[PDB]
Amino acid sequence: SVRHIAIPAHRGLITDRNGEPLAVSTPVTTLWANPKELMTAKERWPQLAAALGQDTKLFADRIEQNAEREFIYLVRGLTPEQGEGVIALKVPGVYSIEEFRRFYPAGEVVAHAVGFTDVDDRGREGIELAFDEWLAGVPGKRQVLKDRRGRVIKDVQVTKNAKPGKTLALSIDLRLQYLAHRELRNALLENGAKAGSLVIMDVKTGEILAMTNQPTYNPNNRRNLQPAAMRNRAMIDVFEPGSTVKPFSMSAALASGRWKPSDIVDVYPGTLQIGRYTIRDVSRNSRQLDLTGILIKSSNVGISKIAFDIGAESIYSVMQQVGLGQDTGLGFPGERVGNLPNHRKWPKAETATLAYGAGLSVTAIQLAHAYAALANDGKSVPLSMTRVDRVPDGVQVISPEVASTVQGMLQQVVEAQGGVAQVPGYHAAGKSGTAAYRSLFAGFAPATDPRIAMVVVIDEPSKAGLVSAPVFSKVMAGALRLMNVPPDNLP
Numbered sequence: 001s002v003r004h005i006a007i008p009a010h011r012g013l014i015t016d017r018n019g020e021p022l023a024v025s026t027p028v029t030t031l032w033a034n035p036k037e038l039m040t041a042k043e044r045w046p047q048l049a050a051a052l053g054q055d056t057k058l059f060a061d062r063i064e065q066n067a068e069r070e071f072i073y074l075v076r077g078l079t080p081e082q083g084e085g086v087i088a089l090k091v092p093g094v095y096s097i098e099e100f101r102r103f104y105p106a107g108e109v110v111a112h113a114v115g116f117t118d119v120d121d122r123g124r125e126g127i128e129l130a131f132d133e134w135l136a137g138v139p140g141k142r143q144v145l146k147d148r149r150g151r152v153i154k155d156v157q158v159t160k161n162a163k164p165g166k167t168l169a170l171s172i173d174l175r176l177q178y179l180a181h182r183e184l185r186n187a188l189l190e191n192g193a194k195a196g197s198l199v200i201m202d203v204k205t206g207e208i209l210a211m212t213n214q215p216t217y218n219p220n221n222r223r224n225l226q227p228a229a230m231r232n233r234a235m236i237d238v239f240e241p242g243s244t245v246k247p248f249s250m251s252a253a254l255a256s257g258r259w260k261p262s263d264i265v266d267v268y269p270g271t272l273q274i275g276r277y278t279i280r281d282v283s284r285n286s287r288q289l290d291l292t293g294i295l296i297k298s299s300n301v302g303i304s305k306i307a308f309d310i311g312a313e314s315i316y317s318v319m320q321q322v323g324l325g326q327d328t329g330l331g332f333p334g335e336r337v338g339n340l341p342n343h344r345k346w347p348k349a350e351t352a353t354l355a356y357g358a359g360l361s362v363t364a365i366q367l368a369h370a371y372a373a374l375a376n377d378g379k380s381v382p383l384s385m386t387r388v389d390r391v392p393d394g395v396q397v398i399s400p401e402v403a404s405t406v407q408g409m410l411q412q413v414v415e416a417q418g419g420v421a422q423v424p425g426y427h428a429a430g431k432s433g434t435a436a437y438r439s440l441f442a443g444f445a446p447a448t449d450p451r452i453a454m455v456v457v458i459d460e461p462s463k464a465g466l467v468s469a470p471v472f473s474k475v476m477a478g479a480l481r482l483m484n485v486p487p488d489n490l491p
């Protein structure tokens with residue numbers, strides 16, 4: 001026969017933004033065998049079987065029914081030294097090829113972002129899949145002719161070296177990723193919740209600094225792996241963002257020319273009839289509220305009446321421009337786009353629902369990206385999961401004046417009240433949402449020069465919006481300090 005013998009390539013190293021290893025190709029031994037040669041040394045089979053801890057008769061049966069085949073694995077991806085224990089038997093037809101297996105040093109802490117490789121050392125999930133073309137490199141080649149018993153008869157013509165894959169530096173900071181993983185895991189146990197997501201973005205660069213989900217898994221130990229636990233929820237799970245989009249409804253109002261923060265809406269009696277449909281506030285002891293008051297009293301009635309005044313088109317436009325229901329450009333296969341509905345004529349019911357964040361569906365990544373644009377004085381920088389050394393130009397999606405006013409309003413949402421999101425030493429700005437409940441918090445800090453945007457989503461808390469705020473407060477306090485951001489609550 002003439003046979004191609006592929007030479008394994010070294011898969012590219014994945015690191016942290018700081019160069020901390022997240023995915024490393026480990027040298028391993030792959031005991032294969034040439035059945036046709038084994039078939040001439042059957043008295044050695046029981047020993048070899050015991051070494052591979054297989055049943056003697058199952059092993060025997062395997063080799064016998066593969067007697068015509070020149071190639072089969074005994075144990076793929078065995079560790080070396082153990083594999084030198086079997087080569088030690090000197091059993092005819094039993095060989096070794098040096099192979100590469102992925103090790104994930106940070107295991108479960110960054111499982112969804114980094115992902116893992118299939119059996120063939122090919123990317124299957126997360127960055128490993130999305131950058132498979134970059135990380136894979138090029139296998140080398142031997143071309144061999146073989147004996148009738150499958151032995152290497154030489155005439156090998158022009159062995160290729162094999163091209164290694166390139167190293168890739170993520171935008172992820174492993175110090176913020178650990179802090180986010182630990183606080184989200186603790187939040188789920190405290191609040192008895194099922195699942196959750198936490199994204200941290202750099203508002204100046206578009207870099208995702210942290211992306212964690214619960215449940216998680218150990219990518220080094222995928223024995224008892226729940227498909228559930230493998231879900232990168234931050235990028236795959238769409239939800240109604242609800243009240244967390246009210247800052248965008250306020251942005252459209254402030255850009256209309258018809259609204260300033262001190263203008264008043266009468267929300268009495270805390271409900272509003274739309275034909276048959278009835279919009280309903282949770283607290284219904286308000287009459288006149290200004291725009292900051294509408295966010296502080298969580299009035300759906302107030303945001304609905306402003307939306308009727310400015311039109312859904314202006315609200316639709318801001319939401320689309322900040323990337324809600326829009327392709328993120330990260331080209332992670334399976335990443336969801338969600339749904340921002342569009343109409344020629346926006347009826348009253350759909351205008352109100354859009355404005356308070358019902359009837360659209362977004363990902364945690366999209367919402368973080370939208371808060372990032374708002375935090376970055378209305379300028380949207382492109383999302384990246386890889387380290388950004390040279391920052392692309394942002395698109396101005398909200399006017400700097402409007403963005404700056406909405407930042408101010410969201411800082412009074414966090415401050416004016418106290419306890420019930422506060423980040424001691426820093427001015428933080430944020431908005432809670434509550435959509436089987438989902439608890440949301442979206443925010444950014446510090447208010448004087450925003451650095452970080454963060455989204456917290458918690459799925460079905462039991463031990464009871466206000467389950468999300470304390471996670472935000474704790475992760476933001478830690479993230480800003482890990483990034484040496486100077487505290488901005490100054491006299």
Ligand SMILES: *C(=O)[C@@H](NC(=O)Cc1cccs1)[C@@H]1NC(C(=O)O)=C(/C=C/c2ccc([N+](=O)[O-])cc2[N+](=O)[O-])CS1
Pocket residue numbers: 241242243244282298300431432433434435464465466
């Ligand atoms: C925006 O998401 C609004 N949510 C709704 O109108 C849908 C719901 C009505 C009642 C509950 S779901 C407004 N935003 C918020 C918010 O900003 O958090 C809420 C919060 C509701 C909430 C949160 C926690 C608790 N709790 O004590 O555990 C109780 C409530 N609640 O009073 O329902 C809803 S209005």
Ligand SMILES: *C(=O)[C@@H](NC(=O)Cc1cccs1)[C@@H]1NC(C(=O)O)=C(/C=C/c2ccc([N+](=O)[O-])cc2[N+](=O)[O-])CS1
Pocket residue numbers: 282295296297298413414415416417418419420421422430431432433465466467469
């Ligand atoms: C609407 O329901 C109000 N929020 C609540 O009282 C329910 C909560 C959700 C999470 C925590 S409280 C108004 N809406 C918002 C908002 O947009 O989130 C706020 C919240 C005020 C507030 C005050 C103090 C603190 N704190 O712990 O330091 C945090 C918040 N906060 O949750 O944003 C105005 S009340």
